[PDB]
Amino acid sequence: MSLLKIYWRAMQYLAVERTATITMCVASVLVALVTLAEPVLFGRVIQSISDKGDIFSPLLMWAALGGFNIMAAVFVARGADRLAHRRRLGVMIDSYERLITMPLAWHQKRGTSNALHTLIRATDSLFTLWLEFMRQHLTTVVALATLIPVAMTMDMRMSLVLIVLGVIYVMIGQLVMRKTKDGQAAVEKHHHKLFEHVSDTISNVSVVQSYNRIASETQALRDYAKNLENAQFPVLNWWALASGLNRMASTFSMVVVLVLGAYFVTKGQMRVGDVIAFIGFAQLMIGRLDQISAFINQTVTARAKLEEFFQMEDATADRQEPENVADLNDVKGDIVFDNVTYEFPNSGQGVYDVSFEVKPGQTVAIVGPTGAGKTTLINLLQRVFDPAAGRIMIDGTDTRTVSRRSLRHAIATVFQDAGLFNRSVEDNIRVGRANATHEEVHAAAKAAAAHDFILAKSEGYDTFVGERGSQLSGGERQRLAIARAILKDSPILVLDEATSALDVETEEKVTQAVDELSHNRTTFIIAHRLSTVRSADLVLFMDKGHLVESGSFNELAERGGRFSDLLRAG
Amino acid sequence: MSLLKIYWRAMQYLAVERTATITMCVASVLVALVTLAEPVLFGRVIQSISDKGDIFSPLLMWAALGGFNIMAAVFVARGADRLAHRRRLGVMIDSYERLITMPLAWHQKRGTSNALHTLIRATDSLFTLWLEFMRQHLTTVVALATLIPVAMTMDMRMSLVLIVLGVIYVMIGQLVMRKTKDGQAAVEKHHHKLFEHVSDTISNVSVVQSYNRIASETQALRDYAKNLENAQFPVLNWWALASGLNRMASTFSMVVVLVLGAYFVTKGQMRVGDVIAFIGFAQLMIGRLDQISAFINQTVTARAKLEEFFQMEDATADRQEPENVADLNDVKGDIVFDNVTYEFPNSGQGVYDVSFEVKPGQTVAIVGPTGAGKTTLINLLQRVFDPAAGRIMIDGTDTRTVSRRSLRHAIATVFQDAGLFNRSVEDNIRVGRANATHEEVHAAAKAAAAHDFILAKSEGYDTFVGERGSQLSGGERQRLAIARAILKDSPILVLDEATSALDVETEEKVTQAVDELSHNRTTFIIAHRLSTVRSADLVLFMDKGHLVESGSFNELAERGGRFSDLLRAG
C-alpha cells in the first residue's frame, strides 16, 4: 500500500499548476472516448448492408473522428512535455531554496555526495513519472473503465472471455518478470566478474608479459566463459517470453475471439462488424496492458529512490520560523562565554564549561593538541547550531535573540579547504564582497601578493578553476582565501591553520601583511605551527576541554608545565 | 557506402558458425511467409459468401498457421540469443588472444584505458547488432521483398498508393530525426551547464553559507532556468512528432486506404477481404519501417565505435610469423653490445653507439642524470622491440635468431609500479613461479621480510588487494615484488629504482638480503640513490647517450670530473 501513497504525493505535487492541468483531464477523456469509438465505427462501416448502401456519411464521420484523434495526439504530447518540464524546474527551485538554508550539521550527518546523487536521480525519475503518465498511461485507465460496461452490455460472454484472457496474460507476464529478476543476480555476478577480470588483465599491460602466462591466463578465462555459459543456459526461454509475450498474447487472443465469433455466427445471431470491433478491442487492451505492466515495473524499480527523496524532503521540511527580530549594528568584538558545552557525537562531550572574555583591540590565539575542542570553539563562535547549555552575549544582547543575518554578516571565516567555484578566478575574487567593483580587487590582490602569480601565469586573471581547486594547489587557493578575507574587511577575523601551505619566505610576508592590515580588529588564529602564534596578543591553552594557561607573552615564561615543554620542543 | 562495408564485415564474422546459421535463414523466411499470408487468410475468412458456408477448413488452417507462427516466435528468439552470445564470447576470445601477445610499444603509443573502453564498448555494440538483427530486422526485408510483387499483382494502384505512403512516412521521419539531433547540441549544453552549476553549489556546502548570497545564487539559478526554458521552447513540436509519428502514419494510412477501397467498392469490382488484407499490410509495413528506422539510427550512432574497433583489429592483425626456431639453454650472462641505437620519439635518438661487455659473476650498476638512456638500456636488455642498428649476442648466438620463449624466460624484471592483480595476495605470490607449491612461498616471504607484515595484519595472507595496489602503499607492493623476484631465482636480475620506497632501517636489510641471496648471478641495478650503488662491482656512467666512466670502485677516486662532483654532492 506504500506505492499508492507515492502516487498520491506525486499527483499532489503535480496538481499545483491548476491552470494547465484541468485541460489535461478533459483531453485524456476525449482521446479515450474516440479511441474506444473507432473500432465500433470500423465495425459499422464494414457491416453496411453486406457491402452496399449509403456509406458516405459513416466514412465522413469516421474520417472526422480520425482527424480529431490526430490533432489530439499531436497537441496532448506537447502540452504534457511543457507541463512536465515546468513542474520539474519548479520542484527543483523549491528543493534548492529549501536546502540552501539548511544547516551544515545535517549535511555532514547524512553526507553530501549521496545527497546530490539521490536528489538529481529522484528529480529525473519523478520527471519520467510525470511525463509518461500524461500521454499513454492516464488515458488507458479511462479507456478500460469505459470499455468494461460497453463490452459487457454488448456481449457479456465475449466480455468475460476477454477478461479471462487479460488476467491470464497479466499473470504470465508477472511470472516471467519475477523469473527474469531472480536470474539477474547470478547472471550479473558472473558477467561483472568476467569483465572485471579482463579489464584488470588487459589494463595491467605489464604483468601479462612479465609472467609468461599466456596459456594459463587463456585457460582461466576459458573456464570463466564456460562457467558463464553454464549459468546462462538455464535462463534462455524466459528471455524469449519477456521479449515476445506481447505478440504471443495478441495473436492468441485474436485467433480465439475470431474462431469463437465465427462459431456463434455459424448458428447465426450476430454480424461481422461487432466481431471486428471485438478484435480491435482485444488488440487495444493487449497493447495497453503491456504499457501498464512496463509502467508498473519502472515504478517498482524507482520506488526506493522516490521514497528516499520523499523522506529527505519531509526531514528538511520542518524548520525555524521566519520573523523580523531585532539585529545588531556596529559590532565591536566584546564576546563573553559562560558555561558553554556542546556534544558533537552524542557519545561524550568534547568541551567542558568555561568562562571566557575577549575585548576589542586585542587578538586571541589558541594552541592545543590533536583534541577536537578547537573545532567546537570555532563552531560556537560562528553559531552554526543551538548550544544545549551556555550563554553567548554580544554588545549587551544575546545571540539567540539576534537573527543570523547581521550576527553572521559581522563575522568572516577562513579554513583550510576553502571551497572555490568552478567558474573564473575573477569571479572567485569578486565574490568576496556583495557587489564591489573592479579597482579594489587589484589592491586586495597586491596586499595578499596574489596578483603577479595570476596575471603573468594562468593565462591572465580570467581562467576557469576546477572543482575543489583541482587545477591549483593548496598555496594558490590559500592565497586567494587570504585575499578574499582581507578585502572583506570584516570587523572580526577567525583563522584556523590558514597559514600552513607555503614556504618560509612567503609565509613571513603573508604574516606581515595580515598583521599590518589588522590592528583595530580582533583575530582568532588557530594553528599548530609556532611561527604565527608569536605575533598574537593573548595566549591561550587547550587540553581536553579544560583551561590551564590564559595570559600574555610576559607571563608564560614560568606559568604551566606542559606549555613550557611544548615551547621548548619546537 | 562505408556502412555497407561495416554490415558486410559484421555478417562475415557472424557466418563463422555455419552449423547454426543456416537454420536461421530458413526460419526467418518461413516466419516472413506466414506473417505475410496471415492477412490474406483473414480476408479470405471474412469474405466467405457474405457470412455463410463451409468455413471450418479455413479457420482450422488459419489456426494451424497461427500456431506455427507462435512456435517460430518462441524458438527463433532463443536460437538467436544463444548464437549471439556464443559469437560474442568467441570474438572476445579471439581479440584477447590476439592482443595479449601484442608488444607494449603500441600499447603505450595508442594508450591502454582508451583501448579497453573502445574494446568493451564495441563488443557490446556488436553484440547488440548481432542479436536484434536476427529477430525483427532480418525477416522484415524478406517480408517486404515478397510483399511488393504480391501486392502489385493483386492491385497495382493500391500498391503504388502504399509505396507513396511508405516513402513519405520515411522522409518525414528522417526530417524529424535530423531536427531533433540539431537541437540536441544546444539543449544538452544548457542542461549540463545548469546541472554542473547546481552540483557544484550544493556539494560546496561551505561557501553558499560563507558568502551570504542566498538571494544572488537564487537569482542566478532562476536566470539559468529561464534561459534553459527559452532554449527548450523552439523545439517542442518535434518531440511530439518523434513520440507519435508511428501512430500518426498508421492511422492516416489506414483511413486513406479504407476510404479508397470503399470508394472503389461503391462502383463495385472487389470485395472486403482484400481491403482488410491491405489494411493489415499497411499496419505491418508501418511497424516494420519504424523498426528499420530505429535500427538505422542505432547503427549510425554506433558507426564510429565499430569503425574504430575494425581499424584497431586490422592494425593488430598483421604480426610476426610463428616458427620453431632454435632457442638457448643454460644461460650464463655474457652479453655483448655493439653500435646499439634506437629512437624512441622518432624525433631524435636518446642513446648513441656503444660497445659494452658484461661477464658472468659480476654485477653491473649504471647511475646517470634525468636523461632517458637508462630506460632504453633496460628495453634493449629485455628486447621488447627490434633495434634499428646494433648487435646483441648471447652465448655465441644472436638474439634475433632466438625466440622470446627462452630468451625472456632466462630474464627477470622489477620496476617501480609493479602491477598486482586484483585477486588475493597468496595468488600474487604464487604467480612468481609457473606452478610452485606452498612451502617455499613462506621461505621467500621470510627472505624478503614480507611475512610478518602480511600474517598478523591484513587479515592473514588471503586478503584481496585492489587494482594498482589501491589498498597498499609503495613499500608493501615493493616488498612483494622483491619477494617475487627472489623466489623466481632467475639467472639474471634487472633492477630499476627497485629500492626507493622505505626507511633506512628496512632499506639496509633489504639490500643485505638481495646481496646475500645473489652472488653467482649478475644484477643490473639502476637507482638515483647512492646507498645501494656501493654494494655493486662494476660502476658505469650515463650522460646523454655517451660513455665517460666505466670501471671499478678502486679506479673512480681520480677518474672523471663530473662523477667526483656527484659523489661528493651526496
Ligand SMILES: OC[C@H]1O[C@H]2O[C@H]3[C@H](O[C@H]4[C@H](O[C@H]5[C@H](O[C@H]6[C@H](O[C@H]7[C@H](O[C@H]8[C@H](O[C@H]9[C@H](O[C@H]%10[C@H](O[C@H]%11[C@H](O[C@H]%12[C@H](O[C@H]%13[C@H](O[C@H]%14[C@H](O[C@H]%15[C@H](O[C@H]%16[C@H](O[C@H]%17[C@H](O[C@H]%18[C@H](O[C@H]%19[C@H](O[C@@H]2[C@@H](O)[C@@H]1O)O[C@H](CO)[C@@H](O)[C@@H]%19O)O[C@H](CO)[C@@H](O)[C@@H]%18O)O[C@H](CO)[C@@H](O)[C@@H]%17O)O[C@H](CO)[C@@H](O)[C@@H]%16O)O[C@H](CO)[C@@H](O)[C@@H]%15O)O[C@H](CO)[C@@H](O)[C@@H]%14O)O[C@H](CO)[C@@H](O)[C@@H]%13O)O[C@H](CO)[C@@H](O)[C@@H]%12O)O[C@H](CO)[C@@H](O)[C@@H]%11O)O[C@H](CO)[C@@H](O)[C@@H]%10O)O[C@H](CO)[C@@H](O)[C@@H]9O)O[C@H](CO)[C@@H](O)[C@@H]8O)O[C@H](CO)[C@@H](O)[C@@H]7O)O[C@H](CO)[C@@H](O)[C@@H]6O)O[C@H](CO)[C@@H](O)[C@@H]5O)O[C@H](CO)[C@@H](O)[C@@H]4O)O[C@H](CO)[C@@H](O)[C@@H]3O
Ligand atoms: O524534450 C523532451 C524529450 O526528452 C527526451 O529525452 C531525450 C534525452 O534528454 C533527456 C535527459 O537525458 C539524459 C540521459 O539520461 C541518463 C543519464 O545518465 C548518465 C549516464 O548513464 C549511463 C547509462 O548506462 C548504463 C549501462 O548499463 C546497461 C548495460 O547493458 C548490458 C545488458 O544488460 C541488459 C540486459 O540485456 C538483455 C536484453 O534486454 C534488452 C532490451 O531490449 C528491449 C528494448 O525496449 C525499449 C524500446 O526503447 C525505444 C523507445 O521507447 C522509449 C521512448 O522514449 C524517448 C524519450 O524522449 C524524451 C522525452 O522526455 C521527450 O521527447 O527518452 C527515452 C529515454 O528515457 C528514449 O528512449 C526516447 O528518446 O519513447 C517511447 C514512447 O512510446 C517509449 O516506449 C520509451 O520511453 O523508442 C525509441 C525508438 O523506438 C528508442 O529510444 C528506443 O529504442 O521500446 C520498447 C517499447 O517500444 C521498450 O521495451 C523499451 O523502452 O529495445 C528493443 C527495441 O529497440 C525492444 O524490442 C526490447 O524489448 O533493452 C534494454 C535497454 O537497451 C536492455 O535490457 C537490452 O538491450 O534482452 C536480451 C534478450 O532479448 C538478453 O539476452 C539480454 O541479456 O537486460 C537486463 C534486464 O534486466 C539487464 O541486465 C540489462 O538491461 O547486457 C547486454 C549484453 O551483456 C549489453 O547490452 C550490456 O552489457 O550493462 C549493464 C550491466 O549488464 C546493464 O545492467 C545496463 O542495463 O552501463 C553503463 C556502463 O556500466 C553504466 O554507466 C550504466 O549502468 O545509461 C544512460 C542512458 O541514457 C547512458 O546515457 C549512460 O551511459 O552516465 C553518464 C554519467 O555522466 C552520463 O552520460 C549520464 O548523465 O543522465 C541522467 C542522470 O544525470 C538520467 O536521465 C539517465 O540516467 O543521458 C543522455 C546522455 O548522457 C543525455 O541526453 C542526458 O544526460 O534527461 C531527462 C530524461 O531522462 C530529460 O531532461 C532530457 O530530455 O536524451 C535521451 C538519451 O537517451 C534521448 O533518447 C531523448 O531523446
